[PDB]
CSV table of C-alpha atoms and ligand atoms in Angstrom, one decimal:
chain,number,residue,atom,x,y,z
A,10,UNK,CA,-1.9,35.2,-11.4
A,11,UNK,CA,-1.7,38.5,-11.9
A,12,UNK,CA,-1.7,38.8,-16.2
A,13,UNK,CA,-4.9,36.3,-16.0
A,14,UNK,CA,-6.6,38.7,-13.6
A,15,UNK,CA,-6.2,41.5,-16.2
A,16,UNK,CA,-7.9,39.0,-18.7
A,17,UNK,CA,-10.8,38.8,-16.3
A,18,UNK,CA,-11.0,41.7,-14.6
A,19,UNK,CA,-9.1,44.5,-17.3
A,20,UNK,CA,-10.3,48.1,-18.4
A,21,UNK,CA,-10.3,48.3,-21.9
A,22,UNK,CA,-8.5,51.2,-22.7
A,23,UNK,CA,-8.1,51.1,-26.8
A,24,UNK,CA,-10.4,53.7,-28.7
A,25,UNK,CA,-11.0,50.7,-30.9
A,26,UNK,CA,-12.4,48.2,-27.7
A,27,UNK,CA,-10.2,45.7,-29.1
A,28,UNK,CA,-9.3,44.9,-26.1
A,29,UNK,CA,-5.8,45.2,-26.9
A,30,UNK,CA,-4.5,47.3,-23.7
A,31,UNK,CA,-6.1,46.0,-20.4
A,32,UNK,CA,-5.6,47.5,-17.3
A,33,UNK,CA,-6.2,47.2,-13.5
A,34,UNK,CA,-5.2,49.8,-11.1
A,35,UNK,CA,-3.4,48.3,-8.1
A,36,UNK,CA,-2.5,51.1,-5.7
A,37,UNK,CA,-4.5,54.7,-6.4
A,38,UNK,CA,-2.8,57.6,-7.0
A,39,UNK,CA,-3.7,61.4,-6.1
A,40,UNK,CA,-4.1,64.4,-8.2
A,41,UNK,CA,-6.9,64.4,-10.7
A,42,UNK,CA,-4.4,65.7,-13.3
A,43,UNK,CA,-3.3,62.6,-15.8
A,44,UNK,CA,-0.2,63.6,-17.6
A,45,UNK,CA,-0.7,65.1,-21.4
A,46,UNK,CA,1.0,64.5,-24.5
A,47,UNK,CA,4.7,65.8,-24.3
A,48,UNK,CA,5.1,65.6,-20.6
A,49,UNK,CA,8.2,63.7,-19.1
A,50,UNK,CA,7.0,61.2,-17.3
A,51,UNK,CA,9.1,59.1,-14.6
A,52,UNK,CA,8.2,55.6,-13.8
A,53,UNK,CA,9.5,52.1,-12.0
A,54,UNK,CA,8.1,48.9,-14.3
A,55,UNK,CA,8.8,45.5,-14.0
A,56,UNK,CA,7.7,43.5,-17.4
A,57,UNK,CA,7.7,40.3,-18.9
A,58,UNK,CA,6.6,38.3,-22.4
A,59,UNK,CA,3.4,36.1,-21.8
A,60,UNK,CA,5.5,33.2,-23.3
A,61,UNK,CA,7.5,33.3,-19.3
A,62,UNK,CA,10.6,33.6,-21.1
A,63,UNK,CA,12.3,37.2,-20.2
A,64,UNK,CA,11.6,39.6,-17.4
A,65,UNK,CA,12.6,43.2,-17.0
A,66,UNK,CA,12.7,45.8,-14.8
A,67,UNK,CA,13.6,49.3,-14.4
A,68,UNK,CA,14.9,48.6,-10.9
A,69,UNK,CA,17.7,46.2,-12.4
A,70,UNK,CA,19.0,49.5,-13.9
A,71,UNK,CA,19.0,50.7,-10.0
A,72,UNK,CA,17.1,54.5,-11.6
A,73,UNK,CA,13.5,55.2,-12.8
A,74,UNK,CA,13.0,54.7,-16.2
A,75,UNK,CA,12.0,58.5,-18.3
A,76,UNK,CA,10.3,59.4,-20.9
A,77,UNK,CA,8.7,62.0,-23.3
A,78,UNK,CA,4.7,60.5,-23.0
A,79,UNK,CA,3.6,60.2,-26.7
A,80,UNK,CA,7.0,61.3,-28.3
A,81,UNK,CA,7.2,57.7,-30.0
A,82,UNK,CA,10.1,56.6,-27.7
A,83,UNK,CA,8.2,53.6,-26.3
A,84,UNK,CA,5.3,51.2,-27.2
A,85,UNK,CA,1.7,52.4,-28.5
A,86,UNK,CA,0.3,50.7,-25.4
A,87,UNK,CA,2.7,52.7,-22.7
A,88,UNK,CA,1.7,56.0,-24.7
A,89,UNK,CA,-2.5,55.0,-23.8
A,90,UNK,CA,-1.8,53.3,-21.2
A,91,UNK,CA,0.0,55.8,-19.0
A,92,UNK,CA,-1.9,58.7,-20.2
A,93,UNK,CA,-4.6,56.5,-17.6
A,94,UNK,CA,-1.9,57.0,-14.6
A,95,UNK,CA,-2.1,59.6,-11.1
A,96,UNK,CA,1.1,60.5,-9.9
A,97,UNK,CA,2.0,57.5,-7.2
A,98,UNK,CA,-0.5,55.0,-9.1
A,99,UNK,CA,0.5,51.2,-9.6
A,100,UNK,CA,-1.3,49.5,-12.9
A,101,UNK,CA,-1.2,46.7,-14.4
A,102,UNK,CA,-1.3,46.3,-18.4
A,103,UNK,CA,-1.8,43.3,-20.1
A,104,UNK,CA,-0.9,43.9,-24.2
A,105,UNK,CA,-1.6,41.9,-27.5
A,106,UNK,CA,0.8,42.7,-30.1
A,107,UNK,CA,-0.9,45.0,-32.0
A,108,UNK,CA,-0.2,47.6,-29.2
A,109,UNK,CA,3.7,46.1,-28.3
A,110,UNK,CA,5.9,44.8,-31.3
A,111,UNK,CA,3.7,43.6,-33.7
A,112,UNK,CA,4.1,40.6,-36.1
A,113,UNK,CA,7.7,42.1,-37.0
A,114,UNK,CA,8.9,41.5,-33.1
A,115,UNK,CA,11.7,42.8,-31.8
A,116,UNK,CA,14.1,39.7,-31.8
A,117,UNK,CA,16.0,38.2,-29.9
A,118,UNK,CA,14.4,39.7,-26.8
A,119,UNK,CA,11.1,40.0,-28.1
A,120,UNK,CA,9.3,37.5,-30.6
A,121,UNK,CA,7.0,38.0,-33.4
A,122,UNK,CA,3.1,38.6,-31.9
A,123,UNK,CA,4.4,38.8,-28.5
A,124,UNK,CA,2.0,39.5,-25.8
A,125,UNK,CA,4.0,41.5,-23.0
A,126,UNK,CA,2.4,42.2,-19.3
A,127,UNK,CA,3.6,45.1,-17.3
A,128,UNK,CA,3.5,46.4,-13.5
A,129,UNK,CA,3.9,49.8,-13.9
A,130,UNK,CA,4.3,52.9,-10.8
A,131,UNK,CA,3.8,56.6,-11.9
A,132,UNK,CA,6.2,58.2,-9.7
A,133,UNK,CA,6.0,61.8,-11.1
A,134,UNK,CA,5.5,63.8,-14.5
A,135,UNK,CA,6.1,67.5,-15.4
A,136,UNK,CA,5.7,69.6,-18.2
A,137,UNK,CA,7.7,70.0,-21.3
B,202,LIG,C1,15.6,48.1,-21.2
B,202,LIG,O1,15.7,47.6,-22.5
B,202,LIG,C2,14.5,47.2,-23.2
B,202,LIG,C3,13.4,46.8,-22.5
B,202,LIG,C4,12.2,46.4,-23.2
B,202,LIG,C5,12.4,46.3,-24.6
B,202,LIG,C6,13.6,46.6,-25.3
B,202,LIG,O2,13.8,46.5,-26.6
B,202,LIG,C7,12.8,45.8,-27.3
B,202,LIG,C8,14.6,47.1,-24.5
B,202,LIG,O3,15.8,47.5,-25.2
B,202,LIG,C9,15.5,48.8,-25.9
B,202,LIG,C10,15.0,50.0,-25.0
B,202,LIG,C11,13.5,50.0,-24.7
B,202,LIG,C12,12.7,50.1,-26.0
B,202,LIG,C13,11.3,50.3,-25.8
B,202,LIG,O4,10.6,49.6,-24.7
B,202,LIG,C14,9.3,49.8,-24.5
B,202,LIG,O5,8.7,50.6,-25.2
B,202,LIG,C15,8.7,49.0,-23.5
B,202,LIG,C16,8.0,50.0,-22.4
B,202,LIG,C17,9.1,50.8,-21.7
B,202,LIG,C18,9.9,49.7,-20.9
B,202,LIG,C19,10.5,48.8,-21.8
B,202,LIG,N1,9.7,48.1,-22.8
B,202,LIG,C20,9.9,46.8,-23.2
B,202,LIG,O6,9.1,46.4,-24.1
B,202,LIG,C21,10.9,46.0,-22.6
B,202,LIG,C22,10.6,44.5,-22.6
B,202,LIG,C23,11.8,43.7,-22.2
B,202,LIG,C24,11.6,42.3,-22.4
B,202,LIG,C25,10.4,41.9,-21.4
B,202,LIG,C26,9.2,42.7,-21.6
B,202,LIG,C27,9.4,44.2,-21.7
């Protein structure tokens, strides 16, 4: 389904092309303006581990999740791969380890070398 379309039919968007952030756009956004280091950034995400075994999404939480884009607050891949988003755009980003948790993991909720795929909505971002 939807991670093994990302496999086929992915953007690389490393600088290294090691293909370790893939992305399709799903819905387009507007605006040609693509939010810049520092910016807060607001988005809706539903995720999941490749191994099918936990899911997560901002909308459990009933609020969008925020934050500061390239701050360090969340995964390498979220800091490239949202630096990619308009404001209203729907992606999808598929992500080997390298770019998530690494060999260390994040246990219990996410193993070591954990691929993690990701529907994510840009619903706004303004300036520090
Ligand atoms: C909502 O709680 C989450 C969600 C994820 C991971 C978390 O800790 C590893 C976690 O607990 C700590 C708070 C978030 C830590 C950083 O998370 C992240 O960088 C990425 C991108 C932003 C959304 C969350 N996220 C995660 O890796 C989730 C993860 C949850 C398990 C299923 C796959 C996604």
């Amino acid at each position: 389904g939807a991670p093994a379309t990302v496999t086929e039919q992915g953007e690389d968007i490393t600088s290294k092309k090691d293909r370790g952030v893939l992305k399709i756009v799903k819905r387009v956004g507007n605006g040609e303006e693509t939010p810049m280091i520092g910016d807060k950034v607001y988005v809706h995400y539903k995720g999941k581990l490749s191994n099918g075994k936990k899911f997560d999404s901002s909308h459990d939480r009933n609020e969008p999740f925020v934050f500061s884009l390239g701050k360090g607050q969340v995964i390498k891949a979220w800091d490239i791969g949202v630096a990619t988003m308009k404001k209203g755009e729907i992606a999808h980003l598929l992500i080997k380890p390298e770019y998530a948790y690494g060999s260390a993991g994040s246990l219990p909720k996410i193993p070591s070398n954990a691929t993690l795929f990701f529907e994510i909505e840009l619903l706004d971002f303004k300036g520090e």
